[PDB]
């Protein structure tokens, strides 16, 4: 009864393509390409140059925001492909005006590149600064990460002042750091990232 | 003009799975979150989260 | 009316001049009615000089 | 990813069904007095929103009288979608019709 | 009222903001460092010949992340 209806939910959230642990760097692979289909609203003023109107109005505000459909921060795009409404490739394709507006909508294929964080991932990025209960990071010079003492073992104390870190070797820690990513929380507009250290 | 555009021209929100108009709803956000649009009968509470 | 898909209809479909004949049997419904009709048989009369 | 593949394949083939090309089209070669209305609405509805105007307008403020200056010179870039009540259609440009 | 009226600018999603349906036509396929940095060499060369001045700089940092040093 309620065993095949749960498959509507298990298949709902779980992303298919994983992040395999590639080239033995410790990092997995998280920059991933997927092609999509929009549903644009072309301006009347971009009737003469309809390729510039689709990109500027719906694709230039598309990069560098977390997108709830792909499940990733959109890094970049290239290659708009406006379809046609005459199933006759060529130049003069034709789009369909809404009956009440002068705004005519159409279909576009376009190609995206996003960032793919998951659970069970291990990544490496520079640390900016730290504290005695949390350590913050930067990934790919675009992506934050934070490691807190509830992810950090006990014997790693803190030299106190900017106060630096004390590990079980007694050293302030370097920039680049290997870490395991916990649940990502997209509450703020800035995409916040949580992470762990223990296996 | 005379039955929508100048009497009750309303742009409501429709859930595209259950097919309703009333039961859509602007989300009351978390204090740093952004008010999105979420429906009611497609929405089940978090308590049903078995494995 | 309040937009331009309608202002063209009020000038081309449902205007008065296209509604010259009735759509009942094709008889006209426009026309001068009382003043000028009895006035016009004086200007068109032969003594108009 | 996979079931939109079983959704665009079905739809655009179904959209490819009911098209009637330029050799098979046999509806009227006239502009049927409502086509002339909705063109002169929606062409004038675009020109109000700073759409490019393919005519030398000389002191005209009305989008309607501007759009009646492009129809007189066959300049309007629209394609009429004449449906037939089975669902089919025939696609007709403004250039290939005769304005009465 | 005072909090409920400015939520039209919180979402600020007209049709000139968002596409209506967003359907990934195919599966996600990963792109390597030789492909990303060649993508970021190709696409960022195109948007430099308007706005988007903020996100170009954000992708230059990812560009220098695979060719230089912070
Ligand atoms: Zn509902």
UniProtKB/Swiss-Prot annotation, chain A:
Which compartments does it reside in?
A: Nucleus, Nucleolus
- Keyword Methyltransferase listed? The answer is no
Instruction: Give TM segment ranges.
Output: none
Q: Which residues carry this modification: Phosphoserine?
A: 192, 199
**Can you tell which superkingdom this protein's organism belongs to?**
Eukaryota
Primary location group: nucleus
This entry carries the following GO cellular component terms, namely: nucleus; RNA polymerase I complex
> One GO biological process from the UniProt record?
termination of RNA polymerase I transcription
Q: How is it modified after translation?
A: Contains an average of four phosphates per molecule.
Keyword set, alphabetical order: DNA-directed RNA polymerase, Nucleus, Phosphoprotein, Ribosome biogenesis, Transcription
Q: Does the keyword Nucleus apply?
A: yes
Q: Name one GO molecular function term.
A: DNA-directed RNA polymerase activity
The record's note on quaternary structure and interaction partners says:
Component of the RNA polymerase I (Pol I) complex consisting of 14 subunits: RPA135, RPA190, RPC40, RPA14, RPB5, RPO26, RPA43, RPB8, RPA12, RPB10, RPC19, RPC10, RPA49 and RPA34. The complex is composed of a horseshoe-shaped core containing ten subunits (RPA135, RPA190, RPB5, RPO26, RPB8, RPB10, RPC10, RPA12, RPC19 and RPC40) where RPA135 and RPA190 form the DNA-binding cleft. Outside of the core, RPA14 and RPA43 form the stalk that mediates interactions with transcription initiation factors and newly synthesized RNA. Interacts with RPO26/ABC23 and with the initiation factor RRN3.
The similarity annotation says: Belongs to the eukaryotic RPA43 RNA polymerase subunit family.
Instruction: Reproduce the miscellaneous comment text.
Output: Present with 4070 molecules/cell in log phase SD medium.
Protein's name in the database: DNA-directed RNA polymerase I subunit RPA43
Q: Which organism is it from?
A: Saccharomyces cerevisiae (strain ATCC 204508 / S288c)
Q: Which residues of the full protein are shown?
A: 8 to 251 of 326
Swiss-Prot record, chain B:
Where does each C4-type zinc finger lie? 15-42
Where's it found, cell-wise?
Nucleus, Nucleolus
Q: Which domain of life is it from?
A: Eukaryota
Summarize the impact of residue 38 to R.
Answer: Responsible of suppression of RPA190-5 and RPA190-1 mutations
Q: Which residues form the signal peptide?
A: none
What is the documented function of this protein? DNA-dependent RNA polymerases catalyze the transcription of DNA into RNA using the four ribonucleoside triphosphates as substrates. Component of RNA polymerase I (Pol I) which synthesizes ribosomal RNA precursors. Besides, RNA polymerase I has intrinsic RNA cleavage activity. RPA190 and RPA135 both contribute to the polymerase catalytic activity and together form the Pol I active center. In addition, subunit RPA12 contributes a catalytic zinc ribbon that is required for RNA cleavage by Pol I.
Record-stated family: Belongs to the RNA polymerase beta chain family.
Q: How does it assemble?
A: Component of the RNA polymerase I (Pol I) complex consisting of 14 subunits: RPA135, RPA190, RPC40, RPA14, RPB5, RPO26, RPA43, RPB8, RPA12, RPB10, RPC19, RPC10, RPA49 and RPA34. The complex is composed of a horseshoe-shaped core containing ten subunits (RPA135, RPA190, RPB5, RPO26, RPB8, RPB10, RPC10, RPA12, RPC19 and RPC40) where RPA135 and RPA190 form the DNA-binding cleft. Outside of the core, RPA14 and RPA43 form the stalk that mediates interactions with transcription initiation factors and newly synthesized RNA.
Its name, as the record gives it, is: DNA-directed RNA polymerase I subunit RPA135
Portion held of the full protein: 1090 to 1140 of 1203
Curated annotation (Swiss-Prot), chain D:
Q: Where is this region: Leucine-zipper?
A: 57-78
Enumerate the UniProt keywords alphabetically. Cytoplasm, DNA-directed RNA polymerase, Nucleus, Phosphoprotein, Ribosome biogenesis, Transcription
Where can this protein be found?
Answer: Cytoplasm; Nucleus
Q: Which GO terms describe its biological process?
A: nucleolar large rRNA transcription by RNA polymerase I; ribosome biogenesis; RNA-templated transcription; termination of RNA polymerase I transcription; termination of RNA polymerase III transcription; transcription by RNA polymerase I; transcription by RNA polymerase II; transcription by RNA polymerase III
| Assembly and binders | Component of the RNA polymerase I (Pol I), RNA polymerase II (Pol II) and RNA polymerase III (Pol III) complexes. Component of the RNA polymerase I (Pol I) complex consisting of 14 subunits: RPA135, RPA190, RPC40, RPA14, RPB5, RPO26, RPA43, RPB8, RPA12, RPB10, RPC19, RPC10, RPA49 and RPA34. The complex is composed of a horseshoe-shaped core containing ten subunits (RPA135, RPA190, RPB5, RPO26, RPB8, RPB10, RPC10, RPA12, RPC19 and RPC40) where RPA135 and RPA190 form the DNA-binding cleft.
Q: Which family does it belong to?
A: Belongs to the archaeal Rpo6/eukaryotic RPB6 RNA polymerase subunit family.
Extra info from the record? Present with 6090 molecules/cell in log phase SD medium.
Name it: DNA-directed RNA polymerases I, II, and III subunit RPABC2
Record gene name:
RPO26
Q: Which residues of the full protein are shown?
A: 55 to 154 of 155
From Swiss-Prot, chain E:
* MF-aspect GO terms: DNA-directed RNA polymerase activity
Q: Does the keyword Phosphoprotein apply?
A: yes
Please give the chief subcellular localization of this protein: nucleus
Q: Which residues form the signal peptide?
A: none
Localization (cell):
Nucleus, Nucleolus
Enumerate the UniProt keywords alphabetically: DNA-directed RNA polymerase, Nucleus, Phosphoprotein, Ribosome biogenesis, Transcription
One biological process GO term for this chain? Answer: transcription by RNA polymerase I
Q: After translation, how is this protein modified?
A: The N-terminus is blocked.
Q: Which GO terms describe its cellular component?
A: nucleus; RNA polymerase I complex
Keyword hit for Protein transport: no
* Oligomer and partners: Component of the RNA polymerase I (Pol I) complex consisting of 14 subunits: RPA135, RPA190, RPC40, RPA14, RPB5, RPO26, RPA43, RPB8, RPA12, RPB10, RPC19, RPC10, RPA49 and RPA34. The complex is composed of a horseshoe-shaped core containing ten subunits (RPA135, RPA190, RPB5, RPO26, RPB8, RPB10, RPC10, RPA12, RPC19 and RPC40) where RPA135 and RPA190 form the DNA-binding cleft. Outside of the core, RPA14 and RPA43 form the stalk that mediates interactions with transcription initiation factors and newly synthesized RNA.
The record's misc note reads: Present with 3100 molecules/cell in log phase SD medium.
* Function comment: DNA-dependent RNA polymerases catalyze the transcription of DNA into RNA using the four ribonucleoside triphosphates as substrates. Component of RNA polymerase I (Pol I) which synthesizes ribosomal RNA precursors. RPA14 seems to play a role in the stability of subunits RPO26 and RPA43. In vitro, the RPA14-RPA43 subcomplex binds single-stranded RNA.
Record's protein name: DNA-directed RNA polymerase I subunit RPA14
Gene name of the encoded protein = RPA14
In terms of the whole protein, what range is present? 1 to 100 of 137
């Amino acid at each position: 009864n309620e065993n095949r209806e749960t498959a509507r939910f298990i298949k709902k959230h779980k992303k298919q393509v994983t992040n395999p642990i590639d080239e033995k760097n410790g990092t997995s692979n998280c920059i991933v390409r997927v092609p999509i289909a929009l549903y644009v609203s072309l301006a009347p003023m971009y009737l003469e140059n309809p390729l510039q109107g689709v990109m500027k109005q719906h694709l230039n505000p598309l990069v560098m925001k977390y997108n709830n459909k792909v499940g990733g921060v959109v890094l970049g795009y290239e290659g708009l492909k406006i379809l046609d409404a005459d199933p006759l490739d060529t130049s003069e394709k034709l789009i369909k005006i809404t009956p009440d507006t002068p705004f005519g909508f159409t279909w576009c294929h376009v190609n995206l590149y996003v960032w793919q964080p998951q659970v069970g991932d291990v990544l490496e990025g520079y640390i900016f600064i730290q504290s005695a209960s949390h350590i913050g990071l930067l990934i790919h010079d675009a992506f934050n990460a934070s490691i807190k003492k509830n992810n950090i073992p006990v014997d790693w104390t803190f030299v106190h002042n900017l106060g630096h870190w004390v590990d079980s070797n007694g050293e302030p820690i370097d920039g680049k750091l290997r870490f395991t990513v916990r649940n990502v929380h997209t509450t703020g507009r800035v995409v916040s990232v949580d992470g762990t250290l223990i296996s | 003009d005379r039955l929508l555009n100048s009497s009750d021209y309303t742009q409501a929100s429709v859930c595209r799975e259950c097919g309703s108009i009333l039961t859509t709803q602007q989300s009351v956000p978390r204090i740093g979150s952004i008010s999105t649009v979420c429906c009611r009968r497609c929405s089940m509470r978090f308590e049903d989260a078995k494995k | 009316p309040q937009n331009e898909n309608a202002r063209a209809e009020a000038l081309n479909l449902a205007n008065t001049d296209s509604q010259y004949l009735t759509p009942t049997s094709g008889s006209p419904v426009r026309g001068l009615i009382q003043d000028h009709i009895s006035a016009g048989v004086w200007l068109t009369s032969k003594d108009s000089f | 990813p996979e079931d939109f593949q079983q959704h665009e394949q079905i739809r655009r083939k179904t959209l490819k069904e009911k098209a009637i090309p330029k050799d098979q089209r046999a509806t009227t070669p006239y502009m049927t007095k409502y086509e002339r209305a909705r063109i002169l609405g929606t062409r004038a509805l675009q020109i109000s929103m700073n759409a490019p105007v393919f005519v030398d307008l000389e002191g005209e403020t009305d989008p309607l009288r501007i759009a009646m200056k492009e129809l007189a010179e066959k300049k309007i870039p629209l394609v009429i979608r004449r449906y037939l009540p089975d669902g089919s259609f025939e696609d007709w440009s403004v250039e290939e019709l005769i304005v009465d | 009222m005072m909090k409920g009226s400015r939520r039209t600018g919180n979402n600020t999603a007209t049709t000139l903001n968002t596409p209506v349906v967003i359907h990934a036509t195919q599966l996600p396929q990963h792109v390597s460092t030789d492909e990303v940095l060649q993508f970021l060499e190709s696409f960022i060369d195109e948007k430099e010949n308007t706005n988007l001045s903020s996100s170009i700089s954000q992708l230059k940092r990812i560009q220098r992340d695979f060719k230089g040093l912070p």
